[model samples]
Target: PEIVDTCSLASPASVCRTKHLHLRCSVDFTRRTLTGTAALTVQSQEDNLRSLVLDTKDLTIEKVVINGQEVKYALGERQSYKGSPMEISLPIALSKNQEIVIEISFETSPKSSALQWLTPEQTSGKEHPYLFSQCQAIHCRAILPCQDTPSVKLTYTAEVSVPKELVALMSAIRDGETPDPEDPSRKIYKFIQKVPIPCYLIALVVGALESRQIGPRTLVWSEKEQVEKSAYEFSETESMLKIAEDLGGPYVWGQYDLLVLPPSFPYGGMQNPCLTFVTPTLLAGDKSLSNVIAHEISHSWTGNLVTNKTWDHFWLNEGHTVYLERHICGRLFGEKFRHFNALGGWGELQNSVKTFGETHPFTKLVVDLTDIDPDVAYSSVPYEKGFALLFYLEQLLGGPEIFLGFLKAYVEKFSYKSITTDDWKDFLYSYFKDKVDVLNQVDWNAWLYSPGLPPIKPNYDMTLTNACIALSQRWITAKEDDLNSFNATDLKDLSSHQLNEFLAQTLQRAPLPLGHIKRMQEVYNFNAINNSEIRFRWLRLCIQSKWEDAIPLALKMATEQGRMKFTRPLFKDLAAFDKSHDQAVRTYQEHKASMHPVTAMLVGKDLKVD
Candidate 1:
């Protein structure tokens, strides 16, 4: 049976599967290329398998060899979202379940989306250069030709060479490093991932880096400039891992590390195995934003372990991680904290729905990605909507005690496999055999296949959100005279997360009056606040209110860091204002080179420039 992977150009898993990989690459800073050799140990699942197809984009294949002999290969006509497939003809037919090694010597392009080459000036320590790879979704082909789909799991070993002044790290356990035999001024770093993982989770970063042991098995890595702050920011990682273990199952990956990427890194966090890549923006003095660590930690079991069969079933990975993340927070803070965080997510889901238009196909839980690029179809829908379905089931089938038991059992069963929604649903029924009647009552189509908000909203405990809502309501109905009565102490009892929720509620509604905006500045003075989540929403409030003074501030924030969570919305806010529309376009054009390839492309489209 052929597996349908809309986003990949590789051969179907039924034909052949890459079971293991050996990557040996050199970091060429001058040419901005990763010149390397990728040796894929493939297994034939079907008899008489003659040719093997792999995903490759913007790569120059120097030569390919099998065993000790050279082999012929050809590239398919290049397509935009689905990159070219390299078809390699085998010298002889393979028997069912027989395995062979295919090695490819290649070089990557300068503009590869997965590889971000940063100049010295772009880094905090302005004396050295940096390079990092982001291969999620389908960018793995740009680095190495393989079956670059999440459905295929492959264990790998890597030896990367970089300038002696810099360090190289991967999403695997460190194997020792040795001096480059050919180049005295360079060093080679080795790593091994014994746990089978998908190509998307294979990541590499070479930079002016240093590391500090933060926990028994964890190390926080970053440039010396921000290493201490990053260590402090992510100190809770060990605790998060323990809680996730309690809820999910055993921690399979031996080392759980965190890497603070350069400001241009795209996402809040990339849950690469072992070394999770986080944004420098998370170093906000206080650990107020370390919830992201909990999120990534949860992925250890949810996304990284029991994976999605294809892009269409992405919710299985993200939705479960979000559910587990909030639960971890609930245990750490309180149960109300979980509900409060979920409430904030509901607002995000609403905004994502409105942005894509309520009837857009992308809003559905199972979106059709046949001819679509996963990135363009990306949003908060999968995460929140998926969580909604699971939460609904939890309530219907008897709360966390019963529901968590199913989750743990689910992870245990699917630990080393990629699965689809249908597979998961079948297991859900199997786990809750006695509760099948209740499960049958769910409007499955409306929840999983229909567009717009979920069919039903769970009755969340609003104990934590009431105060945040009341304060926002006070600001909503307040008049000019009432502004004078407002004081700084109005937010005295609210936690940092609550403050973020307050701004979110305010931004959710219509823009405030000019006088009210001015009063918000006077009393709360959000300008001085440095928490990234709170500050991000606060700036949006300013821009939405059409405050001229905030235009430059918003643009600055958008370009300062390339995390799409903050940058995309900020740019959209500035672009929608008639006053700063052109200014926003100009600002993006000026900063485009410094942004990640994915961030730059998406922002360019959002500003209608590309």
Candidate 2:
């Protein structure tokens, strides 16, 4: 809270330009000593003659310079900045195009930070050169001297010299490559990037990694064995790259590369390009959850190309990414795929709204970039909430085409440049100026600025009504023999969630014609071995019919299942029939952690037990 108050004074749009960096890092696992010479470019618009800032923790600077000349710069505690802020009075007038190269070096003990997980290798030992710079974690300045704010954009090139055995990666084009001749124990890679980016997005990864070519790009895997699996899982990337070119713009860097780190990432993926970083967990041995491949690939166009200026306007980056996911994935896969993906995101946002309250002032458009904690800030709310907001916008506008066009225009206008929240709202206002009242009703202001949940009820009522209509029509057309024709593929038209809902409704109002019930039986049998949802529905129906005949069948599924929504609900319902409400209430209370908030809240209210 104190950090928030301290950082509240600065405009979220304040910029700092970092021109060039020279970094020499010696990394012993969990400890890093960095010597960096950063050439900075500064422009003072407010005539405030302010000092430049960089973030570091438990790091000491060996030297500081301004404008190629050393100065007595003041260093003080600023909780708003993750590291201390460095203040240097300008020797010359700070004007547009004025440049200064501040060459500073510092040592950091990073083992305790969340950045401990941000290493190049997933190893916990002290054997390898496990080094990486988490710019978002306040570790960028530890790697390089920088202006350190998002508002400043400057071209950067780095000379990273590490142990010859290790492979290095950075947010730049590789300058040169050389392999050790006789020793076979040393290697060197030079990298440079001409395009300017915010300091937070600047990255560096260095460790012992194996690299190979995949189509036009280079792929890096922590181990040689993981190469094939990573390649197979991400093979869809070639198609996604082509789709991005057709839908948006060319990849400024002609190729996309990926690095599959060892199995220690908290999340499935991170779009970092020419080098996209991914977790080793994605190497599922079998091709499962490859949707993450598309999600990361789409970021090449959305968050990477047309980036958010500050965290507040992060929706601009993420909303476009969501639409891109639908566009590219739907085109590559199908409309059903896109709808299912969107449905998952909508579900997540509704859940977040339920848990977090949608109107907290923390959600307001102003991003206190200087004062925020990067760890907690990296949740799904930015992605899911942004997707929901865009979906709501599309619902208001009547479809995808208009929203797509708007997104295209926004990206084209701001590509390789920075934009603020006002820039986005202004663009939207220009398009929907006449419908300002509708825009207000959508509470774009409140949604953007607030941080808490909104009141969200299930779209279940509408879904139940629609499913009933569908079932009625299907029932009329069903012939006695058609019961055998029911297949899981037919239910593929429905999502995992929607199918579960339909099954729940069907069992709740069963005792239909024997033919229809038989068809349901076939579906239930087909889905019994599946995850909890389908099995839960089938077991509930068996219990309701007083079918001791199928008790073993139901028990097989009940025992095999883990606790989830449909499963827990079915278990409770069955328990009530077995006894009175007492046992069911006790079980529900005991499993509160495993249930959804709404489900848990309902259970608590009904059970009235501690």
Candidate 3:
């Protein structure tokens, strides 16, 4: 029998492997539910298999049919985060290499963690409701019963029914759409995905959406009001795709479209195959935050094409993607910019290590998900630590010129396949067999198993960051009267990212005097910045300095958006203040409904708000 995912309740792959899913679902905005049927095609791996077990979470299974015959199924005891195992009793054992069709009629409850239903007021147009799905980690099981592990990759086709006033979009490529003749107010959207992806990659979004062509094969989607802005923000997507293709491999996905979701998107972006879901927070007016676009675009090669076999080796997806993102940035921007970004990432890695405790297992590049929920284990560890290791390897292999060959080769070899960390290592060793001695110098055990930051941090190019560094030092040495030296003119030439680095460096110092904080805010208007990245760091500094006046702004920022990167830290800082703790609790309670489930869950734990 093939090994089963320890993180999942699903049985052995040796019993059966899901090949494809034909999903027919209806979106009921009034009830805030998804009524659907997932017809799965499975290949039996062994003879005499008595039952087929699948993973499900918070889903209502109304009926089960096997090969067009009614079948009895039992929902086994529920595990904490792994969900319940649905065991279907087969009347007779099937022979090896047999194929069976199983159809599950189910409905998703409002409490289904994968779904988020938004009110009209929550959307940009404010004329209709919005519904979207986030199924990373293990949330897909809540939407539909399946082998809910990344170890299993399957192609899918979806037929969705929604109000005619709205449009439906999924991870798959759009085939066509048709209106119901009986009910003109309803429309059926059809989509097909030829590229096989894991269940977690399946996504759906229904709303009053508009699209604008950004490139020959790329389009940007958003609410009517945001269509132009989203298109502008992602205008360089085609250039990014071209750079990534040149550096990595050909763009396999036919179209690379982007959907700018509402501000409540928990993360910066979710690489849902052809349609990458992004947060509206990135519409910072300036193209400063577009690096996130590069990151997600890189995932098309490293993550969507060649995926990690299991969540335990998530770094294989994230780490390589980060490396590619930096490479693309370097190619488009400059090598110095890439190194500067890496410096910022190192700071994030340090903070994550501190938060997780330097000795926590979660800090390792390849984490053990034995009994840990993948969501809890998710952090900058994999993205940053993994990049550090890869960067170290690139340096050890001479430079990017020499290392680029290995990267292209690696992607070409693993394209359309799921792999593990060991699989990646073996490939790297074989690719650089001539440099065995240099490779031996690396602490492989420390990189893959150690529970802390990597031993060696890359020496980033300080050319671009020197002014920011000097400015940060100037602030530390400046007295109450010397605040005039730090004004708008000093920041005139700095890019948004450089200013972010300056603020981050300022944060690394001892808490500034309240007077200094006030002076800086007045000079720079940090509180009014639209960029969440800069605003978050500035707010953190304000909190550390005990600027009581910043509490209102902090609360506004916390409740205004649901991106965990911004909300989580702001909530934590607010909760840490005695004067604002009660207000923080109240604020979270008021806004928790607007947050993504994953964001709300983590913020609840942070604030202890139940």
List TM-scores for all candidates, in order. 0.99, 0.69, 0.98
Q: Arrange candidates by TM-score, highest first: which order?
A: 1, 3, 2
Q: What is residue 414's positional error in candidate 1, in angstroms?
A: 0.4
TM-score of 2: 0.69
Cα misplacement distance, residue 42 of candidate 1 (Å): 0.3
lDDT of the structure predicted as candidate 2: 0.56
Q: Please report how far candidate 1 places residue 44 from its true position, in Å.
A: 0.5
Q: How far does residue 487 in candidate 1 sit from its true spot (Å)?
A: 1.2
In candidate 2, stretches whose alpha carbon ends up further than 4 angstroms from where it belongs are 1-16, 22-31, 43-51, 66-69, 78-81, 89-96, 112-114, 117-129, 137-139, 178-186, 218-220, 285-287, 358-372, 432-441, 450-610
* Residue-by-residue lDDT tens digits, candidate 1, 1-610: 4558888889978789999999999999999999989999999999999998999999999999997899999999998967889999998899999999999999999989898999999998999999999998999998989898899999999999999999999999999899999999999999999999989999999999999999999999999988899988889889989999999989999999999999889888999999999998898888988889999999999989999989999999999999999999999998888889888888889988998999999999998899898888988999999988898899999998889999999999999899998989999999999999999999999998999999899878898899999999999999888999888899999989888888989998859997898899999999888888888999999999989998888888898888999999999999999999999999999988877898899998888896
The pairs that clash in candidate 3 are none
Q: Which is the leading candidate under TM-score? A: 1
Which runs in model 3 stand beyond 4 Å of their true positions? 1-4, 181-183
State how far residue 596 of model 3 sits from its true place (Å). Answer: 1.6
Q: Give the alpha carbon lDDT tens digit for every residue of 559-590 in model 2.
A: 23322233334454545455324545555556
Best by lDDT: 1
Evaluate model 3: give its lDDT: 0.89
C-alpha local distance difference test of each model: 0.92, 0.56, 0.89
